[PDB]
């Protein structure tokens, strides 16, 4: 999984996610209009949204659990995969505010209106390994959440605290921990944009055979600390040299170069891991836009054109038919 | 540049490149139908197609010249660059076949149905640096040609002999020679798709943070010799691994991998060197597929919804308008 | 600065380390017998020896300062630098065992006799920057402490805590922190010892050009990062295939792989960073082992040759001078 | 295997080499006078010496054969590995000088005086797989040929042509060819040798952990292909900021950075490969030096010691003994 924020030319924020896995969670676009009141089965824990809420996620027992999504508001969050390093506690923690993993997203969107809101609301918050429904594991986790103000952070639940880092660099993957690829990052101070035509070696002449050879040494392959660094300067590079030019696709773009393609990421299981979808969330404007490995398309969801005084959660179909324009 | 050949699920053949280039060519899709006399202006050489052609490309002087292409029998070929190893001749060399290097593209597609017509073509062959018009200078290139036998050769004039390789990858970059990107292969023979899950290091145990350790040592810049590597190995994974679900899009996912990000990829002149379009010729069907960096849909011109007698050169705009599904 | 740590065939204890460094620091092998007093004269802290001590140092103000040494029952000690995640108290804290940051190395070896005293005794340790003399900044620093058990331990003084890691890689390196480095390792699950001799491209045949085709991926360069990976692997190979054939030439073997050539690695003032020594500690048999970039030579002093109750401190000449057997 | 030749301060020649093999040769150091007739037992090939010789090689049925070596001229000559990419006669070729595989050394170095006199030789020349004794197949080899003059040349015996290279590299490792090498030193054009401090990643600053980021991006595996760029690197820096400090400590701390390590170089057949040697020859001075796996300390045999006009073979016991400086 590959997290992203980017702020295009027109000072607006995009904010989105690869979704990288093996398998299908049975995924639609889900819209969530506000004062609607959420009830999971298997406990007796209720959610009533103070926000409209518009992302990816999938209904389990009529209760909608989320990938990524946005509220009206502008505020974004996306879950990624965070194995090995996190803890959640196995029961509520007394005195602290009790969220269960797989509500962790929605209860972000439909609670806070920024950042700054969910930063103060997370201090005193505790993330629980209680089960959806019956038995069932929750999937290791951690978050990036982001608004319009342009700033994000990432909250990882470790064994000793709830973790909250503010977000620099804007883009997040999995494991390590976030602090861990912000020191990683360090290793790599020493990589350049700008074309290296020449070099004299003594008696022979080296010469560049073609364009990039500046930023040699980049990993490419597709675990999450090697993804981490190319998502991380290659955002770099285009705001320090292409700011005014950042658009919606430019996203895609950066996105692109770290996801991962059938057949070449097997899991022990035999399956190939694969970019499934790439949502990018156009913040201001309430739009979800995304495209899948099927159909490379970019499809738009505005919740703008819903009613956000609805009295129904309203979802769409996970598009996976490739859309061709057909000129002549 | 990165080229690419690969056999779809259903036994069809796509040929197709990433164009990466910092500039326009004033480029727009071309067809041009069968016997079509072709006149040069500056000099007065002049061709006749025997099959009908349809590529990117520009008309220069009211003449077309090719970017890569396809004709009506399923042969394919591919201009990319190839600076420093090339080595063109300055005039005509007597009792030999004297392709203008501008012209080599057309030559292919308008007289030859196969890749081994144009083998037994290219024995008495010789690619002379003759300009277009006026005193311009030709830019310094090697091409891939594909059939729908699936055979795939590389053409490279050098000081010595113009070059015909077998090509046994499905892959082409730029410098330097092909045989030394095929001695490259070589280095990364280490190379896993398959996931190492743990390393048991003595008193210390190692765990796989997330997927893709087996591929740990792929090299990630955009220079010719690290993309080539990529894409040869990403094309190996998934024939060995997902041969009976090989189709367009797949084709797509495979060079993404490889396209220049705006930004990262920066001349000695400043400016962003970036993948300006992807195309992927159905070979078969003669269906040219292309997107570009400004708008990802993948667009599609049919060849034989043409009239193939028809007595005039069609043009189609070269599309930079993103093109988004309104879902609602 | 490398640290590694390593048990020989017959069961004895390698420690030692590569000294990194682009100027001398008056360096000498230094001696101090049992029940010695030392006294610093710009402040009145006073520190007399329990154990005889045996290493590399400095007499500053003719008080001496170690680079790493050993003690009489085993115990050693190596100070490698630790730039940016290191910092001191700037007095003493209330309640807490305060070492100054000069005489740490000194204060483990001379009063410990092992690694479980060491860490007991950090529990409520604390190292503060105060001056050797006058107003002299100390330099930046973590601890690598191991003993005659075969277990090392890792201190590293943040603003937090003084960290004391179990060291279970048997190496050190510079910064970042220790945990950086274990969850680093990580990374690089895929290497392996064993050679690739061949690998099925499709179409191609891929064959080893030499030896060593597993380990394609490890980093080359001669960062703390790439170093102490290098260094881990390499003794973990050891270890792991040749356990009963390691002796005192492996430990240099080992080490030789990350030092420093003069010319490559270039500070910002222009001047060579290089290994200037590389030392070897014999725990159990007393012996200090040690070879120099200019002499390699290894030169060995065994402190059981002094007299362990003697009076006053020895001091032997650090050897820049390349000893060649002359066979004819 | 590595060859290296380095100039020293004083304006004298090193030439020398790693030797990375598994197993013994029945190494001895050899000295051979002037005008001394050897004699093959199993054909009927003879040679007599013009120039006396010495170097590491074998006695086989009597019969001298060099891993490398120098005369008394000043001309050195290495043997290394060279598999797949070589190709020699099955029988003499006429019209061309013949030269038995384990011949080529001595053939060079009892005949000529220069790399000038070498080259011309070479011109008509051919090596033939001819067993030394019974039906024993020849190692693969290519050789690098060095004198007092500085300038050094590569032999390779290819299907097509004998190629003699002007190395202006100053090394040499193994498979694959020496001007594939060249070209792939090409793509490190990026690296640097003085430190890079920072890097602002827009929001975020980079800070350098330690020294030798410019380098990030060097292969650290023992691969041929690694080696040579570790090698030629390592060699270009010393001479770009050391020229004036060059001297045979040096020659050997460049060689140590390349040098196998047991355990971690393993064969098909589980045997460690490592640096079982490394020479260094003072050209000018007729002076041996060299170091083991097992005795890290430079023995030095002058061949102008021995009698040049004497009428025997002398031999050197290869030295696996450690010599250490006991300094009390
Ligand atoms: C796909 C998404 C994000 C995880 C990721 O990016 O890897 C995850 C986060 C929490 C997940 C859900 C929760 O873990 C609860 C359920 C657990 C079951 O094992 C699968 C369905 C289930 C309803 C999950 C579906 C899906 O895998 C979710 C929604
Ligand atoms: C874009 C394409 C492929 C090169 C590449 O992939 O880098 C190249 C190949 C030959 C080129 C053409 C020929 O070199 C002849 C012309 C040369 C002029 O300098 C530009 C226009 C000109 C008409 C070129 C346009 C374009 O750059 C072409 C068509
Ligand atoms: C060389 C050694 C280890 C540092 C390293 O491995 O990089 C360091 C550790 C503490 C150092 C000493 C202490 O910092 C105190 C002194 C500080 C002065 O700036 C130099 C001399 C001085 C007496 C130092 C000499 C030397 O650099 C020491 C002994
Ligand atoms: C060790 C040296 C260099 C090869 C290398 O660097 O890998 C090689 C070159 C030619 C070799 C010799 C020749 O191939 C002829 C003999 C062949 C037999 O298989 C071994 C002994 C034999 C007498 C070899 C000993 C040794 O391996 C030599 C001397």
């Given at each position: 999984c590959t997290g992203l924020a980017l702020e295009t030319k027109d000072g607006l924020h995009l904010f989105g996610r690869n979704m990288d896995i093996?398998?299908?969670?049975?995924?639609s676009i889900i819209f969530i209009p506000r004062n609607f009141k959420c009830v999971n089965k298997s406990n007796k824990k209720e959610l009533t949204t103070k926000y409209a809420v518009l992302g990816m996620g999938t209904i389990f027992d009529d209760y909608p659990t989320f990938a990524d999504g946005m509220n009206e508001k502008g505020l974004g969050c996306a879950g990624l995969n965070f194995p090995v390093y996190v803890s959640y506690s196995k029961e509520d923690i007394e005195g602290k505010t009790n969220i269960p993993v797989y509500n962790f997203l929605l209860w972000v969107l439909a609670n806070f209106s920024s950042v700054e809101e969910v930063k103060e609301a997370l201090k005193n918050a505790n993330i629980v390994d209680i089960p959806i429904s019956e038995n069932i594991p929750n999937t290791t986790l951690h978050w990036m959440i982001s608004d319009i103000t342009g700033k994000s952070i990432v909250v990882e639940q470790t064994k000793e605290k709830l973790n909250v880092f503010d977000n620099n660099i804007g883009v997040l993957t999995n494991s390590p921990t976030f602090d861990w690829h912000v020191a990683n990052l360090?290793?790599?101070?020493?990589?350049?944009?700008?074309?290296?035509?020449?070099?004299?070696?003594g008696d022979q002449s080296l010469t560049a055979?073609?364009?990039?050879?500046?930023?040699?040494?980049?990993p490419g392959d597709f675990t999450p600390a090697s993804r981490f660094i190319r998502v991380a300067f290659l955002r770099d590079a285009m705001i320090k040299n292409d700011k005014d030019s950042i658009d919606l696709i430019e996203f895609f773009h950066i996105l692109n170069n770290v996801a991962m393609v059938r057949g070449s990421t097997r899991t022990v299981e035999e399956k190939s891991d694969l970019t499934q979808y790439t949502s990018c969330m156009c913040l201001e404007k309430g739009i979800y836009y995304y495209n899948t490995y099927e159909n490379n398309q970019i499809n738009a969801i505005d919740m703008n054109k819903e009613n956000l005084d609805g009295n129904e959660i309203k979802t769409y179909k996970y598009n996976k038919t490739l859309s061709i324009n057909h000129v002549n």
């Open positions: 093996e398998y299908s969670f049975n995924q360090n290793q790599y101070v020493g990589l350049r944009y700008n074309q290296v035509p020449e070099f004299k070696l055979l073609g364009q990039g050879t500046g930023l040699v040494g980049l």
